[PDB]
């Protein structure tokens, strides 16, 4: 496609992705009640938790309120795979469990292996709610080699919170 387009002096820019990934970088214990409620609705509870969220106008206004606590951005397929394979897990209602063939078949009548799960999650938009709400929040370690500056500054200022765009993969890869 890129060849055909360049061969006729035109640029193509794909649609923005359907989901962002969010990581809780610093402690919320002194934030206001309005902030605490917003973190609850995104299922974030302890430091170094990571979670996936629908890209949508409501979500983008929720993120604006909490941007001083969280790093966020977009995630390509290679990193999504390493996350699910190395740190993924699930729940039925109050029972926490490992992702196995029996448990997929039970929950989603037509997904049978962990590779089909990752494929649907990335490529099918209309099933995102069901597919996302099956996974538990990911529990990560602090990054290997530490943070370079005062993490509470914005990424533009040289810290660690805010919008890392196409480059969140680098933070997550040090935290798996």
């Amino acid at each position: 496609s890129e060849e055909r387009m360049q061969k006729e002096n035109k640029i193509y820019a794909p649609k923005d992705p359907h989901f962002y990934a969010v990581v809780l970088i610093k402690s919320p214990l002194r934030a206001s009640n309005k902030i605490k409620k917003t973190l609850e609705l995104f299922r974030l509870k302890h430091i170094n938790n990571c979670v996936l969220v629908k890209n949508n106008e409501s979500s983008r206004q929720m993120l604006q309120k909490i941007r001083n606590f969280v790093a966020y951005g977009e995630l390509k397929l290679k990193t999504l795979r390493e996350l699910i394979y190395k740190r993924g897990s699930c729940h039925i209602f109050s029972e926490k469990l490992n992702i196995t063939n029996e448990t997929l078949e039970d929950a989603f009548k037509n997904i049978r292996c962990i590779e089909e799960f990752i494929y649907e999650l990335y490529f099918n938009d209309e099933r995102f709610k069901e597919l996302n709400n099956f996974l538990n929040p990911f529990k990560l370690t602090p990054p290997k080699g530490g943070y370079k500056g005062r993490k509470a500054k914005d990424i533009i200022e040289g810290g660690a919170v805010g919008n890392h765009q196409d480059k969140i993969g680098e933070l997550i890869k040090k935290m798996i």
Partner: protein, 170 residues
């Protein structure tokens, strides 16, 4: 270290490609995110398109060759913010790349005027021949007329204590 990037972008509303114009901007920055930040800054001040109505279509890095590390002369036009106002000026440097030239200016102004790197703006970078040089500083080095000896001593070994009768420096 500093790098050079060129960012391209368009306007959008409730529907796509609302203007047929494309806008471009060359910038020296450390990474792509600091590049994209600058593009947003200039659009909002020279036009009035805020981020929610913009989309970046491309970011590209610009790189030279210089396999033999040949040394060249450059002139740079800049401004910076102080406590009073904004101060414009021009200075000349030598180096193996445009980025090598630009990193030396940023270091200079931080040393001489006590300014953080984000308050300095580059307006123009130009490569020059020997007849073009304006100020005094680099001309002797450009005309190839310099030799000098070493002022700093250098340690011979990593050991902390050594015998009195050994050679200590260089």
């Amino acid at each position: 270290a500093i790098n050079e990037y060129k960012v391209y972008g368009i306007k959008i509303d409730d529907n796509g490609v609302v203007g047929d114009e494309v806008y471009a901007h060359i910038v020296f920055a450390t990474n792509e995110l600091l590049a994209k930040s600058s593009f947003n800054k200039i659009l909002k001040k020279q036009k009035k398109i805020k981020p929610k109505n913009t989309k970046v279509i491309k970011v590209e890095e610009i790189k030279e060759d210089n396999k033999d590390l040949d040394v060249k002369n450059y002139g740079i036009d800049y401004y910076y913010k102080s406590k009073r106002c904004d101060h414009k000026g021009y200075k000349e440097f030598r180096g193996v790349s445009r980025c090598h030239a630009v990193d030396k200016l940023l270091c200079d102004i931080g040393g001489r005027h006590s300014v953080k790197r984000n308050l300095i703006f580059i307006m123009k970078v130009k490569e020059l021949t020997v007849d073009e040089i304006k100020k005094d500083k680099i001309k002797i080095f450009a005309m190839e007329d310099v030799e000098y000896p070493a002022y700093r001593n250098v340690l011979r070994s990593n050991k902390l204590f050594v015998s009195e009768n050994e050679k200590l420096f260089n």
